[PDB]
From TrEMBL, chain A:
Any Pfam family hit: NAT
Protein name according to UniProt: Acetylglutamate kinase
Keyword Nucleotide-binding: yes
EC number: 2.7.2.8
Site (Transition state stabilizer): 40, 245
Positions bound to L-glutamate: 353, 382
GO terms classed as biological process: L-arginine biosynthetic process
Domain annotation N-acetyltransferase: ranges: 288-434, 291-434
A GO CC term assigned to this protein in UniProt: cytoplasm
Length: 435, 436
């Protein structure tokens, strides 16, 4: 109680991710009991890597947060104890469970549950076993699915306790009925119900794969449901399986504020993912729409003049804006990330790419970038040999010429000797921000 | 002890620099508690920045790491030494300090000691006051230099005590003859004797400037005495002071094991310095030497084939090694890092750069590489897209062209036409290594 809370202040204040951590914590003080963070976790995780999952969640709690873990039984019961005590598995719609199957489920869930609760503590944490008592559900089928039910009220009583106790709540997917009868609850429906009730600021999905994947099989860093979602469903390259993950994640995020955001990762990266503007693994949000224009008189110059001053660290120089010509402006509804292109001897030129810290974190920088380079297949830009955005530029560039102070990039398909003459012109261009 | 450990690690394991801090712990878990560091503090730094000082020294103490911090009063001591008076004389090259200076010196350092010890604790740490009882010296010269001495034997019992208890041992520079006589001790001669006695993994020199400087006047991230010490000592931009500093830093490091490393940095930087590849100071190793040669014959190509199978995921194609026509090669004395340069339509072109993780971190990747780009001012290379070292490449290139699979870099002033030419060539060169 004494030594912990304190000896991480005067600890992670000498660490490198340290200031950036203290700051989510503080601002993530939309405490309200357990409004902290709901976390679904695959059954094939509690199995194939417990000590990690358990170290992961222990860190959260000893750092400040109060996770509300929910868990399934996949491998451990979809296999083992049913192909074993020989009741077999009956899949109608998707998964029924006659009377004989119940004591197997009850048995196994309270096992993994406890497995996890104890593991966390083993790993430095404080946790609380909540195997039954939260999910009150009706049995909707009877003659069909046998003994499966739907969450008709959430009981936070027991969760509430753990929260004030400094413990993580570890909840299994069993629910009584209004008459006290046991029944199974697939975790998809059960995370909806819980996440509505609590209204959390964060929603993690801990999977073995620990991510969600772009067109090129790489990890999909960030999704803007507002802009990116449409194309995403109606997209040949996104499988049916993932399409659901989406149809079902929007369903979640639409039930929460815009403060809210879901994160899919694997435990070993979960922390580096909740506390870095980088991240690791897919982060999703309702996000904002982007307005795209070429009519300057259609732009909050003063608001933008703020966006720039804030992003760069210095003020644009006098009457810079009134002069500015403007080929195309892409600005996010909130004005927290913009790109403005002028022209240069007939090349699309990136005059300002300005994005704010928290805007980078919601993955909007990326979102503005995309629409820009979906506009300008040939694009020239410069940057200071300092601006730490250079590395993001270098992976988007196709060309790059370095000098002591400036660095010109291109993203067209022209060649070293074709750009040659326009590359020189960007270097020649004068600073439009001060010292 | 394995109680603290277990958990204080189960935290870092999730911190960006968690891995390197975890390692230091494990290394220095028992019996070597006092073998981790010999932190020397400028008398000037206990003056202005005492709080920040304590807060670093404190942050170490609070993760497992128990320093042996040594100090020497400096300025506050000269000011006080002129108060009473009789302050001057340097007959030799060290000061002369006579009987009258003593009572002041001892009570001046003693106070500085306490000051610091109590400071570390306020900061949150745990420390020990060792104002005297560690430095047993003989007395250099009677008449000439007064009551100055030279350390002969180090009595480490008081520091094992501290270290053993999880406490940073704060040692002040005060001597004591074998006939009991108390005596003045020069900090440098005193730190050398202690680093001997202890054989630390580290020897940190804390200052205000917090780093050594290059010809440019920027900071000198590192040094590789095996290679860099000759060059540095003939250079006309390396003044006296800095020569004399490197000299001493060498005498220490020749006396420690290989793993040892001297850092000179600033209190605010100590963490970054000791737990990031980069740090915020000048870091010095004894290091290993590099050979340069036009003479493929004169190389262990069997080793090299490994160095390159181990760096890259896979090994060179069949016959790559026979075939190869070396322009120049720089291989490190241990074949943990090598640049191999061939020729391409005239230009020097970089056919192999391979640096193992362990070597990349010790700072050899750069040592080979400076040696390369020094030989080949105009250089053309290439790298795959998914290559770890592309960022360092891009920091070092003068321009670069990127295609999906590969990327061609270059250095040196080089006309557009000159460059597009050679570039389309290096894109053409076929895989000298096997595929993924
Ligand atoms: C650009 C250049 C390198 C040549 O290649 P190119 O024919 O123009 O084609 P590009 O290099 O532009 O195409 C490469 C890019 O397309 C992109 N791309 C392709 N598929 C993609 C995908 N699924 N997702 C995202 N980006 C994708 C990339 O962003 C990539 O570069 P990257 O490595 O930074 O990611 C050029 O500077 C050049 O050398 N031109 C001169 C031509 C010549 O023959 N010169 C000789 C004498 S005149
Ligand atoms: N990336 C390596 C060589 C890879 C290859 O050409 O096969 C280098 O340039 O040093």
């Amino acid at each position: 109680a004494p030594g912990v809370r304190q000896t991480i202040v005067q600890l992670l204040s000498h660490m490198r991710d340290g200031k950036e951590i203290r700051e989510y914590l503080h601002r993530f003080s939309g405490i309200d009991q357990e409004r902290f963070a709901v976390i679904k976790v695959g059954g094939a995780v509690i199995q194939d890597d417990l000590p990690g999952l358990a170290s992961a969640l222990a860190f959260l709690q000893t750092v400040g947060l109060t996770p509300v873990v929910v868990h399934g039984g996949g491998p451990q019961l979809d296999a083992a104890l049913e192909a074993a005590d020989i009741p077999t598995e009956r899949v109608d719609g998707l998964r029924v469970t006659r009377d004989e199957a119940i004591p197997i489920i009850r048995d196994t869930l309270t096992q993994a549950n406890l497995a996890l609760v104890d593991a966390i503590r083993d790993a430095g944490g404080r946790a609380a076993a909540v195997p039954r008592g939260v999910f009150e559900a009706d049995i909707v089928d009877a003659d069909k699915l046998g003994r499966v039910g739907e969450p008709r009220h959430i009981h936070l009583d027991l969760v509430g306790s753990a929260a004030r106790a400094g413990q993580a709540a570890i909840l299994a997917c069993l629910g009584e009925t209004p008459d006290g009868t046991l029944v199974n609850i697939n975790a998809d429906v059960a995370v909806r119900a819980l996440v509505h009730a609590l209204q959390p600021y964060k929603v993690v999905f801990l999977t073995g794969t620990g991510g969600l994947l772009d067109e090129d099989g790489d990890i999909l860093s960030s999704i803007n449901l507002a802009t990116d979602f449409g194309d995403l469903m109606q997209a040949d390259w996104v499988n049916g399986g993932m399409r659901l993950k989406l149809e079902e994640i929007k369903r979640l995020l639409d039930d929460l504020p815009l403060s809210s955001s879901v994160s899919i990762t694997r435990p070993s990266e979960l922390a580096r993912e909740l506390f870095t503007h980088a991240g690791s693994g897919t982060l999703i949000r309702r996000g904002e729409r982007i307005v795209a224009t070429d009519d300057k008189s259609s732009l909050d110059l003063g608001r933008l003049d703020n966006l720039v001053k804030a992003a760069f660290g210095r003020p644009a120089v006098e009457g810079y804006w009134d002069r500015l010509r403007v080929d195309r402006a892409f600005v996010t509804e909130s004005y927290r990330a913009a790109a403005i292109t002028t022209r240069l001897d007939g090349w699309v030129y990136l005059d300002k790419f300005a994005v704010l810290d928290d805007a980078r974190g919601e993955g909007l920088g990326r979102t503005v970038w995309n629409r820009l380079v979906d506009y300008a297949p040939q694009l020239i830009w410069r940057s200071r040999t300092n601006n730490p955005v250079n590395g993001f530029y270098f992976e988007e560039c196709d060309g790059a010429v370095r000098r002591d102070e400036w660095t010109v990039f291109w993203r067209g398909e022209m060649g070293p000797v074709e750009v040659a003459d326009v590359v020189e012109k960007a270097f020649a261009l004068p600073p439009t921000l001060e010292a």
